[PDB]
Amino acid sequence: ENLMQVYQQARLSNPELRKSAADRDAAFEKINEARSPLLPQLGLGADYTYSNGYRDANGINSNATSASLQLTQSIFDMSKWRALTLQEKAAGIQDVTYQTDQQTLILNTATAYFNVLNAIDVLSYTQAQKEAIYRQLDQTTQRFNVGLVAITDVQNARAQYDTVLANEVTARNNLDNAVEQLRQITGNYYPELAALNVENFKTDKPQPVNALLKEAEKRNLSLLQARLSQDLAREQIRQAQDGHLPTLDLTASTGISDTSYSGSKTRGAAGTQYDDSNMGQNKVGLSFSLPIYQGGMVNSQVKQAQYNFVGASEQLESAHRSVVQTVRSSFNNINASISSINAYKQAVVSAQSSLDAMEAGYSVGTRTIVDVLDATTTLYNAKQELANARYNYLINQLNIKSALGTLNEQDLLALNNALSKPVSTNPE
Amino acid sequence: ENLMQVYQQARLSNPELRKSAADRDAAFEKINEARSPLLPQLGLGADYTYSNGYRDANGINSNATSASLQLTQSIFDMSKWRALTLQEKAAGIQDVTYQTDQQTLILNTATAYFNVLNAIDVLSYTQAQKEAIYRQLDQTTQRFNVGLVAITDVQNARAQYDTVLANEVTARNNLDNAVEQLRQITGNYYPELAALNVENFKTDKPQPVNALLKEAEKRNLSLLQARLSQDLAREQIRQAQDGHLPTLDLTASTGISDTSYSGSKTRGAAGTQYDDSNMGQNKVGLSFSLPIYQGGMVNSQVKQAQYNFVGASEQLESAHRSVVQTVRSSFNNINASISSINAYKQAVVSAQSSLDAMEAGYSVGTRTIVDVLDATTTLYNAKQELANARYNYLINQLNIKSALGTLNEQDLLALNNALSKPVSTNPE
Amino acid sequence: ENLMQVYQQARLSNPELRKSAADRDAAFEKINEARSPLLPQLGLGADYTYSNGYRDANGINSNATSASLQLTQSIFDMSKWRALTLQEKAAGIQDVTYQTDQQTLILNTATAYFNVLNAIDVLSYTQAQKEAIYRQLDQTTQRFNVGLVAITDVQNARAQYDTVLANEVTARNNLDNAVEQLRQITGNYYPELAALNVENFKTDKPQPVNALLKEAEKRNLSLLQARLSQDLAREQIRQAQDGHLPTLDLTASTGISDTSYSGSKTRGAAGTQYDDSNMGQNKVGLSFSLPIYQGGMVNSQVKQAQYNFVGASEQLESAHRSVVQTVRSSFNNINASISSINAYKQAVVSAQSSLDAMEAGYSVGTRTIVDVLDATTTLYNAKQELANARYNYLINQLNIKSALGTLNEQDLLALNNALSKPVSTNPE
C-alpha cells in the first residue's frame, strides 16, 4: 500500500471530513431557512369561546365560535434581506472551512505515513546496531575463552549490548504506536507500506520566498476565512444601520364568526341586542411602522458592530502575520533539511571510515573496546539522523504546499512516485 | 500518606469535580424548568386607562379601569414534550460527563503521585552518583598528593563532578515542581509519601486485546457520550418533524370592567350611550392553530437536523476510532513497560559488573579515569531508567483500567497495597 | 534595538491587544444598549384596512385607515435593572481581560526576544566548537602528513567535525525560526538586537514566598476574574429571585381613525349605522401584571442560578490553587536558575582546565584524540548551559512579576538596562 492508496482509503471514510461536509450542507439549508420568512406564510385559526357574565352582566352568556385563515407577507423589511445575505456569507465561511480541513486531512495522513516509515527504519537501524555490538561481544568472548584478552572487555561489551537491547524494546514500542496512529487516521490496518528510495532520492530547492509570499497572500485559506469574516462584520454594521429603518407588511384574512347568545337577559330584547350572527369577513390590509426613538438601542448596536468590525480587521491582520510566519518558517525548514541531508551523508561516510579505523586500532592495541562500541553508536546515530532528515524534507515539502493553500491529490501523486518498495509494518 | 489517603483528601475537595457536580445538578433543575410550561400558568392583570377624544370625538373622555385574572394551559403541543425529552437526554449527557471526570480525577491524582515519587528517586540516584564521583575524585587527589598520578586525572574528575553537581541542582528543582503539582491537585502539602516496593514488585501481563476491545465497546464513557449525542440528534430530527404539527390550547379568564365616562358630549344622552358599567366576565375558551405553509422553514429545519444527525454519527465513529487507538496504544505500552523492566534489570546488573571491571582495569592501568566516570554515569542512568520503567508500568495499568471505563477506587486500593514505605518529599 | 524599543513597536501595533481593546469597548457599548430599554420608546403606526363582508355581512364593505403614535415607558420592572447591573459586571470582566492580555503581551515579547538571543549565542558557541575541532583536525593532519601519527586520529577527527557541522546547520535553522517568531510577535524584522552583559550580570534572590503569596492574593488578575465571575453569579441569583416580582408599565398613545363604509347594505340606514368617522384619541394608561404561578419555572431558575453560583465559587477556588502553584513554581525556578548559574560557572572553569589537561596528556601520549574531542564537547555544552541558565533567570524574573500581577513597562526598563551591546540577528 503506497501513499496514494492510503489516501484513497482515508478520504473515502474519514469521520472528521464527513462531519465538516455535514456542517457545510447544514449551512446551505440554513440559507434556505433564512430565505423562508420573506415568502408567504399561511396559518389557520379557530376558536370556541364559552362566556359568562355577572355584575351588570348577570344573565348574559355567550358561546362564540370562530374559524379564520391568515396570510402574512412582508413588503419592505430590510432586516430580513440582511439576514439572508449574512447567512450566505456564513455558508461561504463554512465552505472554506471544509476546504481547509480537506487540506489538513491530506497533511495528517501524509505525516502519519511518514511517521510509520520513520519508526520502521529507526527500528531496523537499532536492530542492526544490536547485531554489530553482539558480533563484537561474541568475538571478544571467543578471544577471552582462549585467554587472549581480559574479562573487562567482555563485561563492557555485555553492558553496551544490554543498553542497546533496551533501546530496541522502546523502538519496537514506538513502531507499534505509530501504526496505531495510522490506523486511527485511515481506519485500516496495513501489513506493509511502500518505503522510500535512497538511491535515486534527490532534493530540489524551493521557490524564492517572495513568490511564496505572493502566492500565500493570494491562496491561503486562513486568510480567506479572515477576509470573509471581515466582510461579514461589515455586513453586521449594515444590518444595525438598517435596523434604523421603518417597516411595512401586508396581511390578508378570511374568517367566519358564529356567535350565539343564551341567558336570562337574552329572554328580553335579544332580537337585535343579543342575536345570533353568521358573520364572515374578507380582510386585506397593510401595516406601517417607524421606530422614532428607542432609547438609543440602535446607536449602541451600530457602535458595537463597528467595534466588532475593528476586531475582525485585527483578526485579519493577525492571520496575515501568522501565514507570513508559516511560509517563512517552512522555507527555512526546507533549506535546513537539504543542508542537513548533505551534512548527514558526509557524517555517515566519515563515521563508517572512523569505525573501521578504530576497529583496526583496537586490533593493534591503540584503541580499546569502548572506542569500538561508541564509534558504532555514533555511526548508527548518524544513519538514523539521515533517515529523519529525509522524512523531514518530504513533510516540509508538504507543509510548503499546504501553506500556499494549493495542497491536493497530485502532490501526493508526485511524492508517491517518490516511494518504491513494500516494507512490512510488523517484523518479528 | 499512601495513595488511598491522598485520593480520599483529593476527591473530598477537588474544585473541578465539584464544578461538574454543580453542572449536573443544574441540568436536573433544567429538567424541572423544561417540565414547567406544560403545567397551569396563572397571571393577574390590571389596567387604568384615561382617555381623551377629539376630531368627531371632542367632548368624549373616559376613565376605564380593569382587573383581570388569566389562566393558560396547553392541550396538544408536541414541541413542549420534545423539549422535555431533549432536556432529559441533555441531563443524561451531563451525568456521564460527571462520571468521566471522576475517572479523570482518579487518573490525575495517580499520575501526580507517581510523578512525585519518580522525581524523588531521580534526585536520590543523582545524589548517589555525585557521591560516587566525589569518592573517585577524593581518592585520585590523595593519589596525586603523594605523586602517584598526574594532574590530568584529578582535573577530569573535577570536571565530571561539577557537571553532576549541576544535574543535582536541576533534579532538586524538578522535585519541587512535582510536589507543587501534587499540592495543586489535592490541596494539601505532604511531608512524606509511601514509596514503591522493589523487592516484591511483580508485573502481570494484561488481557488479550480483543477482550479489552469488547469491554471498551461496552463500557467506555466517551463512547457513551457519543451514543447519547447521536440519539439526541435523532430527537432533534423528531422535534423539527413535530414542528410540522398543529396546536391546541386552553385559556380561562375572570375580569372586571369598571368603565366610566365624562366630558361635554356625555352631558347629552349619556344614559345608554356613554353610561357607567360594572361589567364582569367569566371566560373559558379553546384556541386552534395549524401552520399550512411557512415558506419552507420547517422543511429546511428538518434537513438541518438530518445533516446534524449525520454529523453526530460521524462524531460517534470518530470516538470509536479514538477509543480503539487508546486501548491498543495502552496495551502496547504495558507490554513495552514489562519488556523494558526486564531489559533494564539486566542492564543494571551488567553495568554494575562493568563498573567494577573498569575500576580494576584503571587500578592496573588498562583503563583511564574517564572510563570509570562514564561507566558510573551509564550505571546510574540505567538505575534511573529502571525506576522510570516501573512507574510507567503502574501508570499504564491505570490507563488500561481507565480506557475500559472501569477505573474506580478499588484499583487505587490494589496498587496502594503495592506501595510500602514512607519517604520524605523534601530532603535537605 | 533593545528590549524597550521592541516593546514600543510591539504594543503600538500588536493585533491581539487591539482585538481585546475592541472587545472592551464593545462591552461598554453593551452597557449603553442595556441601559436603553428603561428609557422612553417612541414608535409610529399606520394602517389601511380594506374589508369585505359575506354570510349575514354581505353588502358591508369597509375601508378603515388609521395613523397612530405610541409611547412606552416602564415604571417598575426589576429585571431590566438586573440586566443593567449584569452588563456592568460583564464589562468589568472584559476590562480585566484586557489588562491580563496586556500582561501576556509583555511576557510574550520578552520571551521572544530572549529566545532570539539564546539562539544567537547557541549558534555562536556551536561555531566556536566547530572552529576548535577543525583546528585539532588540521593539526593532526599536519602531524600525519609527516608520518608522526596514524590515520585513525585524523579519521576520528573528521567524524567528530562532520557531526559538529550537522549541529551547526540545525542551530542556524533554530536561529531563523526564532527571529521569525519575533517578527510574528512584533511585526518588524530586526537586523540587530541588544545582547546581555556577562561581566556585570548579577542575580538577586527574590522575596520570601509568603510575601509573594499575599501580593498574589491581592493583585493577580485571574483571581480578580474569578471574584468578578462569582459576584456576577450572585447577581444571576438575584436576577431570578427578582423574576418572581410583579410588573408595572406606562403607555401613551395618539391615534386618528378615518373609517369609511361602502356596499349594498350601506345604501340603507348607513346614517348612524355605518357612517364615516374622523375619530381621534388621546390615550394614557398604566398596566399591572403579577405572575402568581408559572408551573415552577422561577423556582427552577433560582435553583439553577444557585448551582451556577456554587460552580463559580469552585472556579474561584481552582483559580486560587492555580495561582498558588504558579507563584511557588516560579519561586522554585528562580532559585534553581541562581544555583544553576553558579554551578555552570564552576563547571565551565573546570571543563576549560580539563580540556587543557587532556590536550597536554594527548601531546605526551596519556590521552587519545577522542579524549580531546569529547572534552571540547563537554566544555561547549557547559557554555551553552550557562547561557541558557542566564536567560532562564531573566524570564523567571518576568514570570514572578507577572504572577504577582504587577508586570508593566518599568520592569522591561530595568532588565533593558541589563542589556548592553548590539549583536546581529543574521550572521553569514
Numbering used by the authors:
A (entry chain C), B (entry chain A), C (entry chain B): 23 to 450
Paper text:
Colicin E1 is a bacteriocin produced by, and lethal to, Escherichia coli that hijacks the outer membrane proteins (OMPs) TolC and BtuB to enter the cell. Colicin E1 is a bacteriocin produced by E. coli that enters the periplasm of neighboring cells and forms a pore on the cytoplasmic membrane leading to membrane depolarization and cell death. Unlike any of the other E colicins, the T domain of Colicin E1 binds to TolC, the outer membrane component of the acridine efflux pump, and the R domain binds BtuB, the primary receptor shared by all E colicins. TolC forms a large rigid conduit in the outer membrane and periplasm with a water-filled lumen.
We recently reported a high-yield TolC preparation by refolding from inclusion bodies and inserted refolded TolC into nanodiscs. The cryoEM structure of refolded TolC alone is similar to the previously published crystal structures of natively derived TolC alone or in complex with hexamminecobalt but with more splayed loops at the periplasmic opening (residues 165–175). There was local variation in resolution within the model with lower resolution associated with the extracellular/periplasmic ends and the nanodisc scaffold protein. The lower residue resolution at these apertures may indicate dynamics not captured in the X-ray crystal structures. When resolved by cryoEM, addition of ColE1-T to TolC breaks the threefold channel symmetry and the additional protein is observed running all the way through the TolC barrel as a single-pass, all-α-helical chain spanning more than 130 Å. The maps refined to nominal global resolutions of 2.84 Å and 3.09 Å for the TolC and ColE1-T:TolC, respectively.
